[PDB]
């Protein structure tokens, strides 16, 4: 058996050299519709609105994951921990 360590970098480069969507559209639309129903019923959604919402969520998730990885790799650990996300959110000032 060969040692892993190259397929991960290949997938990272392939997903970074492409600008394709990763999350689906209908599940996200149903989720935001269920969230909007908690405040006021009889609400609809468009296509560009949910597209901008998905783009903003993807950017926020990418930034949060990058911050978590940069916080975890500085403690002599190649993997991240569930507390690192809360640490990054406390430093950035998202939950106080």
């Amino acid at each position: 058996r060969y040692r892993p360590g190259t397929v991960a970098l290949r997938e990272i480069r392939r997903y970074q050299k492409s600008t394709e969507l990763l999350i689906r559209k209908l599940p996200f639309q149903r989720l935001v519709r269920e969230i909007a129903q908690d405040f006021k019923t009889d609400l609809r959604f468009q296509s560009s609105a949910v597209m901008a919402l998905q783009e903003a969520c993807e950017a926020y998730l990418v930034g949060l994951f990058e911050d978590t990885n940069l916080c975890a790799i500085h403690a002599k650990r190649v993997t991240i921990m569930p507390k690192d996300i809360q640490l990054a959110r406390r430093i950035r000032g998202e939950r106080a």
């Binding site: 269920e34 468009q46 919402l53 990058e66 190649v78 996300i85």
Partner: protein, 87 residues
């Protein structure tokens, strides 16, 4: 016979192998186990905030259709000037 509204399994819309390639775009190599729940909860809280802002905006405009312009304005008010959709 002919009704039914919505459920709650949509909250678990984030899988586990699909989120592996999502974090690989930023530079994450290995994740964990409770990340699939913590990230889901954080995404749910952020989406509730953005949806509440958009609902308040569409209630100011007396409209029932969440357009892309209202979402862009709410994101800019929060601190994320999104480009592309809207104007």
């Amino acid at each position: 016979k002919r009704h039914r509204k919505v459920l709650r399994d949509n909250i678990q819309g984030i899988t586990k192998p699909a989120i592996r390639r999502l974090a690989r775009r930023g530079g994450v190599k290995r994740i964990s186990g409770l990340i699939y729940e913590e990230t889901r909860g954080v995404l749910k809280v952020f989406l509730e905030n953005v949806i509440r802002d958009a609902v308040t905006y569409t209630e100011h405009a007396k409209r029932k259709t969440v357009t892309a312009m209202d979402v862009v304005y709410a994101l800019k008010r929060q601190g994320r000037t999104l480009y592309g959709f809207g104007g």
